[PDB]
Amino acid sequence: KTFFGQPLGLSTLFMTEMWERFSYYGMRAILLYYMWFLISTGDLHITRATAASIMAIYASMVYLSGTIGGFVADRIIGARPAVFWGGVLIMLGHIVLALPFGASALFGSIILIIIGTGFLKPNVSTLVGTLYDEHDRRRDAGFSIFVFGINLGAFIAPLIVGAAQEAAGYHVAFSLAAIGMFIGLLVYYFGGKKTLDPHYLRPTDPLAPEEVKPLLVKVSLAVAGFIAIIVVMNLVGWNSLPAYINLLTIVAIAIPVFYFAWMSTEHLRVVSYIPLFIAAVLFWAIEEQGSVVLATFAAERVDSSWFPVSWFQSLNPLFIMLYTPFFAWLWTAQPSSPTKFAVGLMFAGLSFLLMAIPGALYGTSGKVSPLWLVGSWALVILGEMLISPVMSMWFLSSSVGSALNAQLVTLYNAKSEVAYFSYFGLGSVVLGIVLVFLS
């Protein structure tokens, strides 16, 4: 008796992550429309472009947070408490949006979910590893299943939450996201006590006595530096919301740039990763624009009067679930991995070049078939299979992509739509071609 051949403990972690991803993408699917709503009613004083930018940098900080969450668990609080308290924070994040408040609750929600997801996401992935001995052949399949649960949650969430929002309003809808996380916590807490190794209740690599001060000094100088930059920003008058978004943008992008510089055999192999890293960043940029630019296109440019427009956010994980089996049968039934990055990026590029067509053909003032978006996601997710299944800089790439997005999505609107999709679509394809030369 197993969970699809794997230890039953995988079900617990499967469920845990499925329900967190549910809460997250349920929130993601309507948060942009929520901010629109708050703007339309005069509660939130930003442009829609800024709103879009907020979505992107939000994602960016979530993934950035995920890059330290593993450290915090491994060295300070343990993987299992990280996941639990991570989940608690996420739930609080959604509860904050379920409360009868408006724009004033957004920052609080975002911070709670940023911190919480940073604690939970990397560490739930870690606990999946813990189900297996070093020599266990099932490890790849186990993770493959675990990834299925991520998208299962990501898939039904826009459906359920979007429907709820339409039916009962945003606050109720966001409360459902809170409930989603609560369900995950329940299964995680009680299921975890039955399946998970007690060793992970504590850090497996606790800070040695002499490691504490140096860590403390490093964090302190960073926070002080960040605070100092903000002080200077405010004295010089660079204190608009977009200004803060730019600071966050710069921080998120400077982080890999500093590792670039930081680091002849091993050299030319670190240098060799840079085009790959750029490729991943650009891919995730495009992929992460699904919930922002494509979310916007869905709401403004699509014949969608008969269903909640947030449901388009289900197309992304739907296609992942559809493609993953095929690519199992395919990688065994061969392109080099850098080549896989190029083509993955090429397909992302094509997913945007496609989107240029309805506007170029039909104009951008009318509405087009939903199939355009369906095809768009079909292409980018095809790209995801090529790059995703194939260390810090890697999970950092998605944060950098979203940071880049915080800048780029503010350029998207009906007037720029065709050029936007065309140029960044063509750019990605070309850089895919560039990678081919370098492959």
Ligand X SMILES: CCCCCCC/C=C\CCCCCC(=O)OC[C@H](O)CO
Ligand Y SMILES: CCCCCCC/C=C/CCCCCC(=O)OC[C@@H](O)CO
Ligand Z SMILES: N[C@@H](CCC(=O)O)C(=O)O
Ligand U SMILES: N[C@@H](CC(=O)O)C(=O)O
Annotated binding site for L-glutamate: 21, 25, 398
Evaluate whether 3 touches 10 at the Cβ level (below 8 Å): yes
Considering the complex, what minimum distance in angstroms separates the CB of residue 274 from ligand U? 25
| C-alpha distance from residue 306 to each of 302, 311, 355 (Å) | 11, 11, 22
Positions at the binding site: 21, 25, 121, 398
> Considering beta carbons, is residue 168 or 438 the nearer one to ligand X?
168
Identify the residue among 105, 253, 345, 408 touching ligand X (CB under 6 A). 105
379 to 398, contacts with ligand Z by CB under 6 A? 398
φ, ψ (nearest 5 deg) of residue 364: -110, 5
Which residue, among 115, 109, 120, 112, has the nearest Cα to 171 in the 3D structure? Answer: 109
- Compute the distance between CA of residue 86 and CA of residue 76 in angstroms, rounded to an integer: 14
179 binds ligand X, rule: CB under 6 A:
yes
φ, ψ (nearest 5 deg) of residue 131: -75, -15
356 binds ligand Y, rule: CB under 6 A:
no
Q: What is the DSSP letter of 236?
A: T
Identify the residue among 68, 103, 163, 186 touching ligand Y (CB under 6 A). 186
β partners of residue 3: 6
Q: Pick the stretch among 66-74, 104-112, 158-166, 378-386 that binds ligand Y (CB under 6 A).
A: 378-386
Beta-carbon count within 10 A of 162 CB: 23
Identify the residue among 33, 34, 63, 412 touching ligand Z (CB under 6 A). 63
Half-sphere exposure of 364 (CA within 13 A, CB side): 17
Q: Which does 220 bind (CB under 5 to 8 A by kind): ligand U, ligand Y, ligand X, none?
A: ligand X
190 to 229, contacts with ligand Y by CB under 6 A? none
Site string for ligand U, 116-155 (x = CB under 6 A): ----------------------------------xx--x-
Q: Render the burial of 200-218: b for 16+ CB within 10 Å, e for the rest.
A: beebeeeeeeeeeeeeeee
Which residue, among 32, 61, 178, 207, has the nearest Cα to 121 in the 3D structure? Answer: 61
* Residue 3, helix vs strand vs coil: strand
- Compute the distance between CA of residue 324 and CA of residue 322 in angstroms, rounded to an integer: 6
> Considering beta carbons, is residue 290 or 370 the nearer one to ligand U?
290
Identify the residue among 27, 32, 35, 150 touching ligand Z (CB under 6 A). 150
58 binds ligand Z, rule: CB under 6 A:
no
Q: Which does 58 bind (CB under 5 to 8 A by kind): ligand U, ligand Y, ligand Z, none?
A: none
Cβ contacts of 20 within 8 Å, gap of 6 or more: 87, 90, 117, 120, 121, 124, 153, 180, 181, 184
Identify the residue among 36, 37, 48, 108 touching ligand X (CB under 6 A). 108
Considering the complex, what minimum distance in angstroms separates the CB of residue 419 from ligand U? 25
415 binds ligand X, rule: CB under 6 A:
no
Q: What is the DSSP letter of 131?
A: T
- Compute the distance between CA of residue 331 and CA of residue 385 in angstroms, rounded to an integer: 11
> Considering beta carbons, is residue 116 or 203 the nearer one to ligand Z?
116
Identify the residue among 313, 364, 376, 402 touching ligand U (CB under 6 A). 313
- # residues contacting ligand X (CB under 6 A): 95
Q: Which does 63 bind (CB under 5 to 8 A by kind): ligand Z, ligand X, ligand U, none?
A: ligand Z
> Considering beta carbons, is residue 56 or 154 the nearer one to ligand Z?
154
* Residue 334, helix vs strand vs coil: coil
366 binds ligand X, rule: CB under 6 A:
no
Identify the residue among 96, 120, 156, 157 touching ligand X (CB under 6 A). 96
Site string for ligand Y, 301-340 (x = CB under 6 A): ----------------------------------------
* 3-state helix/strand/coil string of 33-76: HHHHHHHHCCCCCCCHHHHHHHHHHHHHHHHHHHHHHHHHHHHH
Q: Which does 289 bind (CB under 5 to 8 A by kind): ligand Y, ligand Z, ligand U, none?
A: none
Residues that bind ligand U (CB under 6 A): 25, 150-151, 154, 290, 313, 316-317, 320
Residues that bind ligand Y (CB under 6 A): 88, 95, 185-186, 189, 354, 358, 362, 368-369, 371-372, 375, 378-379, 382
